[PDB]
Amino acid sequence: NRIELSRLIGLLLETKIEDKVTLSKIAQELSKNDVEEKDLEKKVKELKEKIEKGEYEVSDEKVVKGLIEFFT
């Protein structure tokens, strides 16, 4: 991972055509961990379980957090 990622990051910095490629290769490497899947529903089914079951509140804070933590 780093083994290769390192190789590339360097390969990239030694110098864009080939770079755009080298870069394109780095990009490729950074997604391989598509496995982020986790709680593919659990986080949601939980939320709903807390949506109808009055266990989820819409505090302008949380809403503002999200909005900022994202936009900044």
Binding site: L5, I9, L30, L67
Partner: protein
């Protein structure tokens, strides 16, 4: 510092923040047409991470990191901004889908399943969706520029006054967020604060994607207008 030692400090940095580019992109993707290649995002992402590490002056791991993100994101948005998101052709698709959904809410006496809207528009559900996301992102970007003004406008007194001040905007949002309809806020929170895609939101609300999708787009438009 031996040129090789520098050369490595840099590398090991750009390398330590690669994951940041990752997540940022992976996240900014949850607001884009499925057809946008994440790889492309991550690419431009990296660019910025470097440009950042590069034009970077020592600071605290907390302060430095903040600069990194603000550059990665920048890199990315700039790219996205280059696409046809603001197109009028999109601002129209908006209005039209509004009609269609309203026309069917009446015609059926309920919230049109996405596909009903799909069929009524004479397009794929897939198509419908990509189009909603485009519309939405248009606002997401429109809304970006808002935070770019609450800075590039004041920031002039940002070096002349060189982080805890930004908590002004941090509160400047709790403003219009108080003005966010009980429904609209519920979606936003589920999308942003919750780190969730429209498709998933409609599942947590047993509604339509087009429904949630229209809500988000409605919300942002508000927030944009108020915070503007």
């Amino acid at each position: 510092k031996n040129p090789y030692s520098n050369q490595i400090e840099r590398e090991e940095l750009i390398l330590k923040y690669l994951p940041l580019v990752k997540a940022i992109a992976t996240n900014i993707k949850k607001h884009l047409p499925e057809d946008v290649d994440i790889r492309d995002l991550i690419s431009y992402g990296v660019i910025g991470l470097i440009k950042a590490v590069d034009n970077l002056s020592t600071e605290n791991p907390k302060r430095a990191e903040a600069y990194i993100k603000l550059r990665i994101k920048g890199a990315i948005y700039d790219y996205l901004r280059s696409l046809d998101f603001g197109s009028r052709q999109v601002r129209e698709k908006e209005r039209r889908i509004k009609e269609v959904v309203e026309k069917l809410k009446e015609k059926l006496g309920r919230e049109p399943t996405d596909e009903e809207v799909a069929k009524e528009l004479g397009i794929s559900t897939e198509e419908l969706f990509k189009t909603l996301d485009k519309i939405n992102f248009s606002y997401i970007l429109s809304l970006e520029e808002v935070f770019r003004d609450f800075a590039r406008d004041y920031s002039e007194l940002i070096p002349s006054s060189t982080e805890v001040i930004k908590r002004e905007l941090t509160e400047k949002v709790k403003e219009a967020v108080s003005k966010l309809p009980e429904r609209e806020k519920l979606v936003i929170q589920l999308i942003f604060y919750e780190e969730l895609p429209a498709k998933e939101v409609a599942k947590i609300l047993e509604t339509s994607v087009s429904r949630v999708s229209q809500l988000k787009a409605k919300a942002l438009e508000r927030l944009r207008e108020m915070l503007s």
